[PDB]
Amino acid sequence: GSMKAAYIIKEVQNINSEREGTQIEATSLSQAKRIASKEQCFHGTVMRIETVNGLWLAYKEDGKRWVDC
């Protein structure tokens, strides 16, 4: 299909915390955002998209718009 890059999606309790994530493949950051929003499992949490080496790409507080980093 389309050329895809590796992204790491993490679900954390607050913006400035670190937890283990899971690796997904997406064609763009926007598709990664859609996947991350669909993968949220807990209540009121923050979703964050990083690169594999741990670079913050974006994050979304529950009920807010994505914050691009």
- The experimental resolution of this structure, in angstroms, equals 2.0
- The domain spans of the chain are 5-68
Rounded CA-CA distance 24/15 in Å is: 21
Contact (CB, 8 A) for 9 and 66: no
Cβ–Cβ contacts within 10 Å for residue 33, how many?
Answer: 21
Rounded CA-CA distance 41/6 in Å is: 21
Torsion of CA 39, 41, 43, 47, to 10 degrees: -40
